[PDB]
mmCIF file of C-alpha atoms and ligand atoms in Angstrom:
data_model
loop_
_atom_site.group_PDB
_atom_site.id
_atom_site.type_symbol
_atom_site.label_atom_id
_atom_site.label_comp_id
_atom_site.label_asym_id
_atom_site.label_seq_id
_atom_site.Cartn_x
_atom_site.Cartn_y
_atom_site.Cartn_z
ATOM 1 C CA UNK A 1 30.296 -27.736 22.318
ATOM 2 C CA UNK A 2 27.991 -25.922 24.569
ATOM 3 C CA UNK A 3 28.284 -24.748 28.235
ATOM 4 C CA UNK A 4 25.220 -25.261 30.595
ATOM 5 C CA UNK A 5 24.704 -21.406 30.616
ATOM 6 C CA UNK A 6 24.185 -21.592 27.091
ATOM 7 C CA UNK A 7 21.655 -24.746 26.845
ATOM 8 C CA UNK A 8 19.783 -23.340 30.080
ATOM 9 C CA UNK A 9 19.829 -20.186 26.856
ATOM 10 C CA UNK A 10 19.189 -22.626 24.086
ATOM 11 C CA UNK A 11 15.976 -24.053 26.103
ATOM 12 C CA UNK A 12 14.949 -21.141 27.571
ATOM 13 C CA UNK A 13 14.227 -19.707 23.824
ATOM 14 C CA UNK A 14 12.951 -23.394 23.247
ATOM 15 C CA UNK A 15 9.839 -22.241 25.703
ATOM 16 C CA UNK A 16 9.039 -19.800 23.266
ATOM 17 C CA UNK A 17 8.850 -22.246 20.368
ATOM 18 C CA UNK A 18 7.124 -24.714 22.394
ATOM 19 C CA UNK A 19 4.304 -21.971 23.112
ATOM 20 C CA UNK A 20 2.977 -22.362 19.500
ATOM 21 C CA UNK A 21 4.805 -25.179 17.849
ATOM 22 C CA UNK A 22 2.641 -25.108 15.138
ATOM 23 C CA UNK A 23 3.077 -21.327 14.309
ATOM 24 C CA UNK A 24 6.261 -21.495 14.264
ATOM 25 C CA UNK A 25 6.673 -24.270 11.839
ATOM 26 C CA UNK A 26 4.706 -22.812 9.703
ATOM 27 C CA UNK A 27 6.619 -19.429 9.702
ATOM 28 C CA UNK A 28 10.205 -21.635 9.436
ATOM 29 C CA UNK A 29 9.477 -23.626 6.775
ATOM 30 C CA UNK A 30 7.798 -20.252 4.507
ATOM 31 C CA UNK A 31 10.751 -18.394 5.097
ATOM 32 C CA UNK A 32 12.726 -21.359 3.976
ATOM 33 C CA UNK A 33 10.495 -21.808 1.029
ATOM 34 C CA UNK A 34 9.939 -18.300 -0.197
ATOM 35 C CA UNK A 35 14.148 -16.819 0.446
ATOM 36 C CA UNK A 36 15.289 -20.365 -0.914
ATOM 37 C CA UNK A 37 12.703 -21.433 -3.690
ATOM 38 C CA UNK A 38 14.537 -24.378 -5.089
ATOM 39 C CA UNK A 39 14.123 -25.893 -1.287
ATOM 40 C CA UNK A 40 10.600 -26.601 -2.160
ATOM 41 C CA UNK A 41 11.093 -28.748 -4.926
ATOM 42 C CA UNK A 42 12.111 -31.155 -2.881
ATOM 43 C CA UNK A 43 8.514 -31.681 -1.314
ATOM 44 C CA UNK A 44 6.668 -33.619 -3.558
ATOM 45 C CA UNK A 45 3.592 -32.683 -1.226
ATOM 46 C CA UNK A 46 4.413 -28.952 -1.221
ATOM 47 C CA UNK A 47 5.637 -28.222 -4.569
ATOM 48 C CA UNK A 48 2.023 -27.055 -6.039
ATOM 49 C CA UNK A 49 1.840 -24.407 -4.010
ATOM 50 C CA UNK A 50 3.207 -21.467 -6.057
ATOM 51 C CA UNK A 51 2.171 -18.178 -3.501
ATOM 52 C CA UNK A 52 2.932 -17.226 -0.483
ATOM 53 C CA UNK A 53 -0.729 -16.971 0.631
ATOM 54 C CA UNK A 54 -0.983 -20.499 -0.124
ATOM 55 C CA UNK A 55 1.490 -21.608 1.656
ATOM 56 C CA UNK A 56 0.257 -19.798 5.116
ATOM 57 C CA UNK A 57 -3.327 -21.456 4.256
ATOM 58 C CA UNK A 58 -1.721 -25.195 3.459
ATOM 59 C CA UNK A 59 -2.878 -26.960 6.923
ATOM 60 C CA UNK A 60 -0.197 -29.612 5.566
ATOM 61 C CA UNK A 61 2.497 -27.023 5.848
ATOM 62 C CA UNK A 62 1.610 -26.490 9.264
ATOM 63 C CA UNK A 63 1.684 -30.142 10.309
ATOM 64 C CA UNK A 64 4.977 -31.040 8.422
ATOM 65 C CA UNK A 65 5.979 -27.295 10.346
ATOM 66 C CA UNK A 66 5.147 -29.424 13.971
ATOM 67 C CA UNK A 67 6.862 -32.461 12.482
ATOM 68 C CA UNK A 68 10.243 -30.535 11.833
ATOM 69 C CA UNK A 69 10.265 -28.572 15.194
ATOM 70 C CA UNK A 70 9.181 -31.215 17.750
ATOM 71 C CA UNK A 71 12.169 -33.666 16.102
ATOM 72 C CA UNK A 72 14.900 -30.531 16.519
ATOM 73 C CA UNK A 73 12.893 -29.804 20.119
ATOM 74 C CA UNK A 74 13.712 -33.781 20.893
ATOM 75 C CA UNK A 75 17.252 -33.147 19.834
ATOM 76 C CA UNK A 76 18.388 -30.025 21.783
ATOM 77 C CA UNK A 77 16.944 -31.344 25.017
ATOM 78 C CA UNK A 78 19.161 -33.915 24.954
ATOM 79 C CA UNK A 79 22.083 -30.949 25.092
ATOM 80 C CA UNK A 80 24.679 -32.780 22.697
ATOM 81 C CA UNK A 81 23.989 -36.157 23.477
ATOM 82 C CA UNK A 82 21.762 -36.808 20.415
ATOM 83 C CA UNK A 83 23.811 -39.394 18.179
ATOM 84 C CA UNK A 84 20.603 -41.867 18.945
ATOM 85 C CA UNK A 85 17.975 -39.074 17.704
ATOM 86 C CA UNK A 86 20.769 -37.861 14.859
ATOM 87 C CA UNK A 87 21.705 -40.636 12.986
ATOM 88 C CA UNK A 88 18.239 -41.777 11.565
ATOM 89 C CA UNK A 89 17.561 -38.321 10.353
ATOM 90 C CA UNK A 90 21.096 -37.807 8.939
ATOM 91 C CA UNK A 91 20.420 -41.154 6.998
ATOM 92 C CA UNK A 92 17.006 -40.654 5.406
ATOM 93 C CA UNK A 93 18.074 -36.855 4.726
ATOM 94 C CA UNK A 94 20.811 -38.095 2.729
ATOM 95 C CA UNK A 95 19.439 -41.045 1.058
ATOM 96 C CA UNK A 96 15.773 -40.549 0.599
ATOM 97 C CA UNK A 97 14.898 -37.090 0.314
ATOM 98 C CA UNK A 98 18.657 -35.795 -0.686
ATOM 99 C CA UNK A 99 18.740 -32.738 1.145
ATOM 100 C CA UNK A 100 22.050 -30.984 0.853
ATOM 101 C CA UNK A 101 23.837 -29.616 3.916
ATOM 102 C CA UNK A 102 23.318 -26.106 2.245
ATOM 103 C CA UNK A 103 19.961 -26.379 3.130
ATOM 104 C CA UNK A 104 20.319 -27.094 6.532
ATOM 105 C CA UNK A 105 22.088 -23.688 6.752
ATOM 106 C CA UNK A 106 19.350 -22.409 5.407
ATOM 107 C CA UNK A 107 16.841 -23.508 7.511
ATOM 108 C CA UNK A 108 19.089 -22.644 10.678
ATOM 109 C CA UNK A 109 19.633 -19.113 9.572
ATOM 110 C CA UNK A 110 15.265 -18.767 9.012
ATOM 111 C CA UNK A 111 14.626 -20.135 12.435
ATOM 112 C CA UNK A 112 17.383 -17.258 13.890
ATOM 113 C CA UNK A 113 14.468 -14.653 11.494
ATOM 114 C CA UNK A 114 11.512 -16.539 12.582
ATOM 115 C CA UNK A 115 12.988 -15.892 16.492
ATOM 116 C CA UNK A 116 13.647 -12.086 16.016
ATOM 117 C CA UNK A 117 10.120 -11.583 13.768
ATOM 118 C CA UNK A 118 7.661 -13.510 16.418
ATOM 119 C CA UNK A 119 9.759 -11.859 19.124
ATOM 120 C CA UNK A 120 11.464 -8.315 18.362
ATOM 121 C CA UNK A 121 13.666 -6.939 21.254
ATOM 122 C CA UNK A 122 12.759 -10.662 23.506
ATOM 123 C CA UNK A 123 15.538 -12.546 21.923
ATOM 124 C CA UNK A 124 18.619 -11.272 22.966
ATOM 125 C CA UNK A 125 21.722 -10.996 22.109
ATOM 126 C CA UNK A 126 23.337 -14.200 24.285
ATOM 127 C CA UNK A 127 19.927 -16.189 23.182
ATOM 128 C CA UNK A 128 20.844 -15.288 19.790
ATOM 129 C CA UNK A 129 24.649 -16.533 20.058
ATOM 130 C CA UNK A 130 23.504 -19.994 22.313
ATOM 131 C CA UNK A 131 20.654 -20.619 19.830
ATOM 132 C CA UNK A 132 23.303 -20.457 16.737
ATOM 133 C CA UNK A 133 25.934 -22.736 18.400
ATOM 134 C CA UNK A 134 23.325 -25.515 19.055
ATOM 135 C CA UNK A 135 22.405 -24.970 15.437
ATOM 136 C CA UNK A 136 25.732 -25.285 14.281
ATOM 137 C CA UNK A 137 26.479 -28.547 16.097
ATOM 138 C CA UNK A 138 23.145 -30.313 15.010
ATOM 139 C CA UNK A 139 24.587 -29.458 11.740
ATOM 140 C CA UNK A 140 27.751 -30.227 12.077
ATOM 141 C CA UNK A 141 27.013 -33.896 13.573
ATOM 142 C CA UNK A 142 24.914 -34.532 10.246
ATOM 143 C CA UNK A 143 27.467 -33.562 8.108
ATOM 144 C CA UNK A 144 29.730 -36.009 9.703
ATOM 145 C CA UNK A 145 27.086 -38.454 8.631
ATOM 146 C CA UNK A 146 26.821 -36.968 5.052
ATOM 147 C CA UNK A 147 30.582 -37.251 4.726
ATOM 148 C CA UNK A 148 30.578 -41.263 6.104
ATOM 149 C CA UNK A 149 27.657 -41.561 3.383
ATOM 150 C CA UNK A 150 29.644 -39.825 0.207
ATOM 151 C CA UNK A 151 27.132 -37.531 0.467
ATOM 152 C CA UNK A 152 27.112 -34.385 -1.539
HETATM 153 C C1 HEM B 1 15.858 -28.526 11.427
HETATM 154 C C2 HEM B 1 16.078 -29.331 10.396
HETATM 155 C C3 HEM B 1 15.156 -30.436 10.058
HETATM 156 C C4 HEM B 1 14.559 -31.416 10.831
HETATM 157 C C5 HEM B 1 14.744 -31.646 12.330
HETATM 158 C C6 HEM B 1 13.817 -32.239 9.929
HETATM 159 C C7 HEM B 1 13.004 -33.311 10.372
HETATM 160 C C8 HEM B 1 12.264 -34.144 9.543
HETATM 161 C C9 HEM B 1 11.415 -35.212 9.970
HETATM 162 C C10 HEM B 1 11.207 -35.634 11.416
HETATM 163 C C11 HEM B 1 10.888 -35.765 8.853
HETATM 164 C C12 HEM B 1 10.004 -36.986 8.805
HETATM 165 C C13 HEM B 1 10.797 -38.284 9.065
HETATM 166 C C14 HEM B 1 11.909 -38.482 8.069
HETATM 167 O O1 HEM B 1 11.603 -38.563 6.856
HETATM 168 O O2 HEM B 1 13.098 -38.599 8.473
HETATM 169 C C15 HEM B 1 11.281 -34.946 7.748
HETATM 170 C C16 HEM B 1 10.869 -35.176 6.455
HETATM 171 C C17 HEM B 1 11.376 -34.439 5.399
HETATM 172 N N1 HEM B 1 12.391 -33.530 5.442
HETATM 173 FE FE1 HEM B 1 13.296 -32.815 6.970
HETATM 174 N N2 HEM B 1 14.014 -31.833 8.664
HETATM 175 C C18 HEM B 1 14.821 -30.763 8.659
HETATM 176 C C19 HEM B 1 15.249 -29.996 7.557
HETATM 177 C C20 HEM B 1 14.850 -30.206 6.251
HETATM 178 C C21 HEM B 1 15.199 -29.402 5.153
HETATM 179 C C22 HEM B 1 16.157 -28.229 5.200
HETATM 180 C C23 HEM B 1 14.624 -29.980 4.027
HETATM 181 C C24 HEM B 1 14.564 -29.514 2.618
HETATM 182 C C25 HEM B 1 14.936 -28.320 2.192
HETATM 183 C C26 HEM B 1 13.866 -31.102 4.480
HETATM 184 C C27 HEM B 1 13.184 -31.954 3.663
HETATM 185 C C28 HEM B 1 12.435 -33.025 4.160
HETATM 186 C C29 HEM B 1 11.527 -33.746 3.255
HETATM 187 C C30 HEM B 1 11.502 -33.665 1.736
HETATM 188 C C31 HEM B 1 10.839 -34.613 4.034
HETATM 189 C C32 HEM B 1 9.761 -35.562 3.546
HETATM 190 C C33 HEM B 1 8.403 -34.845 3.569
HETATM 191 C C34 HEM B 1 7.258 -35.720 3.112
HETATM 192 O O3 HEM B 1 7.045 -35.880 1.892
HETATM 193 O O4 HEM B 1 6.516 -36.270 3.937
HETATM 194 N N3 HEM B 1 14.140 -31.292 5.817
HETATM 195 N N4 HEM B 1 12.206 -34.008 8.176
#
């Protein structure tokens, strides 16, 4: 549960994403990959690449990097009221590409280090702390799905 001063915070950083989607993607989804290797074997289409270097020159990484970010941009405009936009990602994350929740931590806690390394000393500390909570509910609402589902 969010305030309005903190969504006017969450979308407010948003702006920044939204500059360069496709950057940011890209740098999300290689932190996720290279702090939490076994994350990329689930990516059939990823999996081959075995450097860093080949990640940032996989044009493919950068598209499924715009995929990812303009469904979670969807999401946190509609501040809270997402269960529409939710539920078929909750389903086909637990059923077809078995994602645990741990790895939506994961990827919540790079796009927090993606924020402070694309924007040192521009994402402050209330950003930081609005950003988070929105993070935290998008994950908590999936793991009430994951639960519902059995899961694990
Ligand atoms: C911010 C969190 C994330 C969002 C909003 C997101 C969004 C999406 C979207 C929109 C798709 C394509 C449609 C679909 O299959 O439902 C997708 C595919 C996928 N997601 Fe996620 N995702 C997230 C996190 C993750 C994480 C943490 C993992 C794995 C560590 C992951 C693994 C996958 C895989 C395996 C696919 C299929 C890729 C392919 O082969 O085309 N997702 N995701």
């Amino acid at each position: 549960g969010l305030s309005d001063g903190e969504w006017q915070q969450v979308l407010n950083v948003w702006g920044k994403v939204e500059a360069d989607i496709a950057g940011h993607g890209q740098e999300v989804l290689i932190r996720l990959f290279t702090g939490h290797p076994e994350t990329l074997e689930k990516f059939d289409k990823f999996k081959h690449l075995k450097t860093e270097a080949e990640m940032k020159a996989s044009e493919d990484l950068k598209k499924h990097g715009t995929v990812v970010l303009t469904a979670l941009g969807g999401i946190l405009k509609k501040k809270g009221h997402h269960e529409a936009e939710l539920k078929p990602l909750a389903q086909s994350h637990a059923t077809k590409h078995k994602i645990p929740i741990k790895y939506l931590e994961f990827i919540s806690d790079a796009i927090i280090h993606v924020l402070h390394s694309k924007h040192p000393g521009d994402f402050g500390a209330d950003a930081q702390g609005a950003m988070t909570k929105a993070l935290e509910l998008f994950r908590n609402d999936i793991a009430a799905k994951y639960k519902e589902l059995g899961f694990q």
